[PDB]
Amino acid sequence: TTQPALLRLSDHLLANYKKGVRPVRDWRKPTTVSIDVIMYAILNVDEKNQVLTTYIWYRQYWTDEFLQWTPEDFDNVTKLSIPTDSIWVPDILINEFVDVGKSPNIPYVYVHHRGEVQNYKPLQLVTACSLDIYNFPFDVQNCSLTFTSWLHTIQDINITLWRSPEEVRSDKSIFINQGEWELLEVFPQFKEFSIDISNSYAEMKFYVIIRRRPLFYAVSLLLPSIFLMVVDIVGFCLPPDSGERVSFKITLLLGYSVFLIIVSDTLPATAIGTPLIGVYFVVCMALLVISLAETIFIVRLVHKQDLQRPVPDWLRHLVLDRIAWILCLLAVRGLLQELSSIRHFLEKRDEMREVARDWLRVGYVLDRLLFRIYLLAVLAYSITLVTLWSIWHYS
Amino acid sequence: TTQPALLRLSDHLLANYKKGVRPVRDWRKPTTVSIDVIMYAILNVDEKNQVLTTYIWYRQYWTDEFLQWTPEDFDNVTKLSIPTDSIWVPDILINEFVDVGKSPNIPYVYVHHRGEVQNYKPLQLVTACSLDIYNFPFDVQNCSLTFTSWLHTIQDINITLWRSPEEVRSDKSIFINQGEWELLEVFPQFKEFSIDISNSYAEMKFYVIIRRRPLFYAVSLLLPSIFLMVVDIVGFCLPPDSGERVSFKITLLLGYSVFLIIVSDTLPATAIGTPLIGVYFVVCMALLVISLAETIFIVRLVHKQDLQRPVPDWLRHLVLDRIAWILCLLAVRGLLQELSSIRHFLEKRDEMREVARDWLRVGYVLDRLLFRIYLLAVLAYSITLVTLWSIWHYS
Amino acid sequence: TTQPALLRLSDHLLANYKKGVRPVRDWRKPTTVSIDVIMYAILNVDEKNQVLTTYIWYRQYWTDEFLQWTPEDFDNVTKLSIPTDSIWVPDILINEFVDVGKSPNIPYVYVHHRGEVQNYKPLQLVTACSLDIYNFPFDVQNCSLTFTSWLHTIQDINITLWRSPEEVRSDKSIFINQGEWELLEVFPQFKEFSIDISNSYAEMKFYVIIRRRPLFYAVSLLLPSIFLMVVDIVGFCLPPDSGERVSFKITLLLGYSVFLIIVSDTLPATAIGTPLIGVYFVVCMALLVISLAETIFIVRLVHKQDLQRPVPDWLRHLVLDRIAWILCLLAVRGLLQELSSIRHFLEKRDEMREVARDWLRVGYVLDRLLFRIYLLAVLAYSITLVTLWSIWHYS
Amino acid sequence: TTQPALLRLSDHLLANYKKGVRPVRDWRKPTTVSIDVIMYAILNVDEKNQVLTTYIWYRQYWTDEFLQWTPEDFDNVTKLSIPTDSIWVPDILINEFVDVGKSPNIPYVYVHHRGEVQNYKPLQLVTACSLDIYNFPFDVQNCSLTFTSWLHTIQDINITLWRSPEEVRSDKSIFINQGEWELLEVFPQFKEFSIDISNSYAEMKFYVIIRRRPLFYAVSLLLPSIFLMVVDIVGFCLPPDSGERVSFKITLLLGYSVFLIIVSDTLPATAIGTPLIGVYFVVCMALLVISLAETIFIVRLVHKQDLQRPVPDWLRHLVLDRIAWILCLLAVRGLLQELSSIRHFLEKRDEMREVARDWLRVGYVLDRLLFRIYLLAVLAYSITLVTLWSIWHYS
Amino acid sequence: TTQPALLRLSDHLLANYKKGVRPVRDWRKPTTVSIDVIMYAILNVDEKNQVLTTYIWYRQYWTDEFLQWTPEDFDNVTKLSIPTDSIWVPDILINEFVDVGKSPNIPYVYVHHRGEVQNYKPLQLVTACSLDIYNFPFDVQNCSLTFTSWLHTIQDINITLWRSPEEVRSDKSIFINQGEWELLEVFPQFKEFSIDISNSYAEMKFYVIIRRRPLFYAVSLLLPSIFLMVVDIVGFCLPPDSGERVSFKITLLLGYSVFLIIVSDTLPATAIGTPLIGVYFVVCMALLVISLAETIFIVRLVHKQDLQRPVPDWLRHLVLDRIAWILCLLAVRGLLQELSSIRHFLEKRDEMREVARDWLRVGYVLDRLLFRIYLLAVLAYSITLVTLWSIWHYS
């Protein structure tokens, strides 16, 4: 006729059409829907709430048996666009959502002459998947997205795949590499789900496996620790009898304590998780306690409290074994008694000074030996940590 | 006829159908709705606002007397799917909500040939239930969800249970165990509610009882306290006459004060609640005050202010009772007077030195005794705390 | 007829019915709406924004002159349920709202045979009312909720009360007592409001008077202050010539300064408000300044700078009035000159030592007197504060 | 007729009425809309985002040429209420909005017999206006709200004023005075806006001028500064040779540095703004640096390093000009040589003591002079600041 | 006819009009849409989320072949306004959005007699574009906005430009210059996009290039660093044997450490980014470590531990090369032996004092030399930094 073809085709197709009925001529034949998903970015990964926010492009197609026409008529039209609200649409959802998707509405769909109906839409998904932070900097996380019909059983709707699963898992075409997380793979799988023995449903589960870039957090956590390790080393270099060594040690301990306290609230959030970063912190913690205890012991040994002479049993071997063995390095009577009083006073003063000499020397030797032992221990621990990092990196 | 069965059945059912009228042939017969709920996860538990955010799967069914047909006709169809907006739907809500549920819309329901109508939907519930944190790490919380019709009375709508209450309370089939909270049970109950003496309503109350995992918070709260207890012990080991003991004690007190101040804002929020964690903090608080007072007293006794000799009454028993009892461990006259001047000066200097000797020894003995007493007290308190934790754990 | 009664009654009532017209046969007769409100909980009280978030159950009724029928017909039906969107509904709002209510939609209302139309709905109200925190822990707050028609004047719609105002103000049936705030009363009042001399409106103002529970904040604010008051007392007990007293005082002052700085941002928010808690803080502030000034003065008096002897005018009464009055407590010539040199040197050394004696004793006496005065002042201030708290509590 | 008048009038008016067409008989005549706005409260002023959140009551009117009727008919009805969605409504918006208004929908409007159509609605406006904080405590801010038609040009719609601009700017009838900001005026203006040379539009710009109450922030910023100024004064009162003066000064500097650091993030947010509060802080900053430098210089001059005698050139005038000028205030030979050894030793010791005497006295005099100079400088600065505050206050 | 023209024109145009069909007489001819965008403000730039929030004014036009009429009829009307929902509207979106735009709805569009249809609307865009902070204060950022049809291919819809691209990039007519960011340019480009080899699409990409104002952050980051550099200088001026130098250095180090820790969380957020501000911080970090090490070494050399005399090999050149070379600056026997005892004691005391003399002088000379070297190094570093800033500024 003289009417435009795209008008009369739509008039013929949409005439006496019911959108509330499943478009099958036989009710015993299920409606097959084929879907696929392409990842766009990882918006957010919240560990304290275990919430994954992501952006996907999702397209699906199915067959409508009431939307067929002869191509020879209506001016050779193979396909056209039809409003979404005027046709039947399956209710495909995800079981893992926790927030309603704030996605825009697409008001048009393709309709072909064979009954093929296709739908494209973006989806902002806020789902909940379990997150493990046992190795927090180097964690690899899998999350599940389960597409299924919320109401219809497997006797009415199953879900298939638009493309082969081999090429779906290795698309990575439009993913945003810049960010905190890096996508590894998206593995699809089909399953039959049934809580009851009564009804059965068909589900398509996508396992999204992603990895976290550790470049920033590793250095941001390791730099101040080794930095104050060096500061502690120059604190050891100090003399023990100055008296400010204890204040220096407690000031450094306060600084690192407040640093770790205000750091440990940000990254750690999982109740069941226990990262080895805490083990590293506890080891450093203990090394600082040993340092403080050694400093206190040396200060107590060096300090003067009118103490007695060094007891010989240790002394006859201690000074000997730290050189070339381990560390290579009438009026006259009254006048005489009167002057003897001052002589005795100065003699006992000199004896006290000599005792202080010997105790100070012993304390210095012990401080040197303990400093050497601590330095060797720190070097060994640093070597172990760096070789563990290397054996991770080489893989 | 030649028309498809699923089309003509829907046309016959939805013809001259009013969705604004209760579907009963007799107005004196109430409409019975049977509901059930399955828990999916505990999204959030806010104590400062007393807000519970949870995710449930809720399904209900009822009977429609205007949606019946003969199975022999319309090609043997026992049941079909009908749009939700084209039929009457009861207004079942929860009295405890504080935020509108951001749940998606399910546009289809099942309709059977006997008038059976079923509805499935997910619900994100943000309700308000009282929370008690008297024993915060080991708290067990019950919350109430009251499903009822907001307008219709018991003469029109009651609520029943789809399944037996015995199997409802022990489902736990799809609950997410990973998280902060662990679900214990969901007990259902039916009640008649009436504020006025005028109208009566039927309500279904679900008591959700859940438990909190204490593994993280307990250690995160107990570790720094005992850690600085050890640091305080090495502070006690110090000599009292060094002069830096008071600075060390006040620095440790400042550190633990700022730590507790910046910790006590996060977890404690309830105005009426008073956890025993505060009691533990106050006991440690007092133990630190006793420690500081003992240190100040020892410093005051040890310090030199040109004080007099130790008064004998205490001295004749104090030094004796701390060994093997408790702690086992002319020109000539002018010259003579001139030299006697220096002799007297040095004699009084030696007397001052001896007095300082004796006072220092007394202070050292007292410091040792108080250190022993403090150590025994700390060990006893630690034993009591650990045995209380054990008697909780064994239950 | 054979048609079901609930169907034909609705068909007769809703036939040729216009929902956009006020349902009055005479346009000169205003439509009377009777409303009432029941409080459920106090969700939030924000002082920095002066925002009150609350939850109410609100029900209203009016008369529709186009919804009447004979009870004898339609099978003895006195009342039924009708969709809300198919009938005229007045636009009753609150003038004080600042956020749109996120309340669910109730799609049904009661309709009686006399034209009685009733509506029930919950309302989450986010309004703005002035808050005064002059006595912040013990504040009693009134807020206003003004229900009125936004467009219709008093010639069309007034608002009445469903129940007597005597029983409305003392309902408190479903209020949640657990929380931060406690409800006292809800007083209703009717008023005529008119900005212009042109149009007049009818308004129903509910004054909600509530009270705040002070059990938590009072102790949480008073505990650390008195705690460090005790710590300051043990700091006073210290000797003045030790040299670490000034460091102790400034460390305590820094601790309380940082504590008050990080506390004063949370609770105080009102610009015009000035709580007496700030007055208490300022008084403690000044007492600490007096303490520091006394410590500095005593240290300056005690310290040795090769100063001269104590000037007699004060000394002849100062030491006397602090005991039993207030505080009860040739070769020979060369040799002689040579030895006289040492004699003079030791004599002047002894004179310096005696001067240091006397100045130290004077400083100790002054320190004791000032410590007694400070202790009496603190005890008096504590007595005044506790008796003020008691005279508030007894009321 | 016997039909109710309010029903038949609405039936006659709404019959064959098109709401999608501008209601003019001649297309060349523009439609005039008269609007006005009344301010209710200032909800929020965000400086870091430059966002103004406010609440207004907005009413407008226009003329509809298809809604006229004879008053003599339909029972003397001059005006009625009509649903908003059934009539044409102009699209008047604000160009400055950044967030969609969360305002409720008013479903009724007045219609008069002359075609007068009136509309009332509340509006929660979240707009963006430039904020200047050059004088942050005493800033007066103007913001612009531009009402205009988003699509229609000036050939179709202009905007006029309901009332005279003289009485609009001085309404202030329902404004909430309690809060942070105080409203000064609302000045209206009419303008023609055109980006292109093609189309022209009519706009109504309201300039809202408001003022900020400075009572809280001024005292909250000035109190701790002067407080620690007093504490610094008592620090100056200390002796210079005690050795704890440097620690006191650095502790006070650390306290004020951390205070200013944790304060400067809250109020200052504008990148281009530079308040004079920063100038005050920098001046105090420098005064503290001068204080620390003076303390270090005095400590260096006073300290003992076995230094030599005070060089006479300064000494002969320095001590003189600070009193009453500025500051008013054989065997015998062996024995003789042997004793001469001790005599020389004690003589050189006495010489060192005398040199220390003189250097200590010089340091004390210099410290007193610098303390006087610093006190005079602080008093002058305080006088200047208080007289600047007074000359602002008197205006 | 006597009917109003604007009514009958709309009746003729909207009669039997289908809004669900593409308005083309021939299905082989694509529909061309011409769009343009004008920037209004940069609302937000979030680096941790890489989110750009902006406000644009967007207008588009196309041709409708079913909306044509003869101008001679309907009273000379060239154009009119038509509701948006009654006509076909293309689905043009942006691929980069992450949040649904909260923009208001414009319910009217222009329709001309030639089929020209125009649409104007504001858009609040929340998109995701990569942000690089390698030079954070002086960063220039490009972001992409890709307008395309979400469903229709290039065989149905392409996108053109309303204006020439030369004048689009340099509009900057209504942009808000006040703020954090400054707009540089908006470059448009047309592209054909196709993931598959199957379908092709037309896209219009706008590259928005903007710049950040560095005036605030630069000074706010450089001021405290140089400030405490000056404080460190006055710390160097101190004597080394006082004993409080180490405490001063560690207090300053603690202050700058806590400052940098609480600053480094705000601005730095990108994982892959590494600003040179961190390099500046690390250089200052190292300079402070060198300062502390020098102070510790000088303190260790100066301190007295009853050490021996200065070993001559260094001493014979060290003191010489730092002046005018680099730094210009019977009874008798018993009595004799008795007195010889005191003579020997005082001789050895004098020898110890002389040794302490020499070691103190050597330490003072070394401290002066290291202070000079450190001052020269700091001056050189400051010169390098200021000349780098100058060579950036001149460009």
Ligand SMILES: *[C@@H]1O[C@H](CO)[C@@H](O)[C@H](O)[C@H]1NC(C)=O
């Ligand atoms: C739906 O598809 C699955 C595999 O994709 C298949 O196993 C199942 O049999 C299909 N459903 C029916 C009813 O055949």
Ligand SMILES: *[C@@H]1O[C@H](CO)[C@@H](O)[C@H](O)[C@H]1NC(C)=O
């Ligand atoms: C509704 O059910 C309850 C128990 O589920 C029952 O007690 C009540 O009688 C029922 N309602 C009516 C009107 O019978």
Ligand SMILES: *[C@@H]1O[C@H](CO)[C@@H](O)[C@H](O)[C@H]1NC(C)=O
């Ligand atoms: C509406 O009610 C008030 C009191 O509730 C009454 O004073 C007023 O007269 C009533 N309105 C009319 C038009 O009578």
Ligand SMILES: *[C@@H]1O[C@H](CO)[C@@H](O)[C@H](O)[C@H]1NC(C)=O
């Ligand atoms: C609209 O009003 C303005 C002043 O309010 C006037 O200048 C303008 O001419 C009016 N529009 C027309 C088309 O006359």
Ligand SMILES: *[C@@H]1O[C@H](CO)[C@@H](O)[C@H](O)[C@H]1NC(C)=O
């Ligand atoms: C759409 O426009 C582009 C350039 O704007 C042009 O290259 C393309 O050919 C056009 N589409 C068709 C179908 O011609």
